[PDB]
């Protein structure tokens, strides 16, 4: 029944995934990066060297100025702009139109990307982390409040020109194989989850699970990498190196400071290990695990040479399950039931020998203690 929403995402590898959104009246359609890691809907609204088009408020009869500025800082970049509301539809999304808050971006720093094809960002997380404060209703909240659309969306991010699907209001079964396994949303701010165990090629990293979630773990479609707290990152690299020891790589490769390239079509995927994260399940003492391949964590950087960047990196703000994780899976953001589902993606990049996996149940004790508290 959701067929018209299939293949509604596009992107360039490593530059996020975007969906078309139509704003204002008469219609102004823009490409909008989908970000489960923030909660502001914002669009370029003035010329920028990296923008080929932008929102023109004076041409929208339905634009309402909120007479208030807004600023959002991200990990490296930031933008400043002006708040208002306008009519918004997603032409390859649900068949509704809502009046939503929109931040019109007038200035920015290291936000837009040269040649990315996107012109704005759709923050799909919860009001608690919206700027300027939690009173600025996020887009998805407006969608659910104003319409019949069920309080759920799902993302199938298909890695490498990338594509995928954002199904809004439900789940499409053509997008995954096997079973969906759910982890609780710990708290409605970011999409926060609890990681309870980590394995490299089946070998337990053997760290206290409190390290994996210090100070939070989140599912973030607007971040390319799998980002890990420093102690966890260091242990993971040590283990990944040991597992791939038949080949030698410079220290800088593991730090993302050096690329390694193979002649077209010869990448020895088989010499790199799979990586598993166990997540808290829906039943007491029950967990499940998601497993990704080097096809997910070694990312192509665009001749006759295939160059790759190691896309697991260090974080000082907790674990971030970015595209590196999401590209293996169909991920269901079941806001109505405060849970996130994972299943093997029908589109994920793999080979004849290994596939990404979602497996369970396992027995894991004292999972509640894994989470960070202030």
């Amino acid at each position: 029944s959701f067929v018209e929403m299939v293949d509604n995402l596009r992107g360039k590898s490593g530059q996020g995934y975007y969906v078309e959104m139509t704003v204002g009246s008469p219609p102004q359609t823009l490409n909008i990066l989908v970000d489960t890691g923030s909660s502001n809907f914002a669009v370029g609204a003035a010329p920028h060297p990296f923008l080929h088009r932008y929102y023109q408020r004076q041409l929208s009869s339905t634009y309402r100025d909120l007479r208030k500025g807004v600023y959002v800082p991200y990990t490296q970049g930031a933008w400043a702009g002006e708040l208002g509301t306008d009519l918004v539809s997603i032409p390859h999304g649900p068949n509704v139109t809502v009046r939503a808050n929109i931040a019109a971006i007038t200035e920015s720093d290291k936000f837009f990307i040269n040649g990315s094809n996107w012109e704005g960002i759709l923050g799909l997380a919860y009001a608690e982390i919206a700027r300027p404060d939690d009173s600025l209703e996020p887009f998805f909240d407006s969608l659910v409040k104003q319409t019949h659309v069920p309080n759920l969306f799902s993302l199938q991010l298909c890695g490498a020109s990338v594509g995928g699907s954002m199904i809004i209001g439900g789940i499409d079964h053509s997008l995954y194989t096997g079973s969906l396994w759910y982890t609780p949303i710990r708290r409605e701010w970011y999409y926060e989850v609890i990681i309870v165990r980590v394995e490299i090629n089946g070998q337990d990293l053997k760290m206290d699970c409190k390290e994996y979630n210090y100070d939070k773990s989140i599912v973030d479609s607007g971040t390319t990498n799998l980002r890990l707290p420093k102690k966890v990152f260091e242990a993971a690299v040590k283990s990944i190196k040991a597992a791939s020891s038949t080949e030698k790589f410079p220290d800088g490769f593991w730090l993302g400071e050096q690329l390694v390239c193979w002649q077209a079509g010869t990448t020895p995927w088989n010499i790199f290990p799979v990586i598993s994260l166990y997540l808290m399940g829906e039943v007491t003492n029950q967990s499940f695990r998601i497993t990704i391949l080097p096809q997910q964590y070694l990312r192509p950087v665009e001749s006759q040479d295939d160059c790759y960047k190691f896309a697991i990196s260090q974080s000082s703000t907790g674990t971030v399950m970015g595209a590196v994780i999401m590209e293996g899976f169909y991920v269901v953001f079941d806001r109505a039931r405060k849970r996130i589902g994972f299943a093997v993606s029908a589109c994920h990049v793999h080979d004849e020998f290994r596939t990404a996996a979602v497996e369970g149940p396992f027995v894991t004790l004292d999972m509640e203690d894994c989470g960070y508290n202030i």
């Binding site: 923030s38 982390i129 973030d220």
Partner: peptide, 7 residues
């Protein structure tokens, strides 16, 4: 790459 909220 992209590295989307500060915090």
């Amino acid at each position: 790459x992209v590295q989307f909220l500060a915090x």
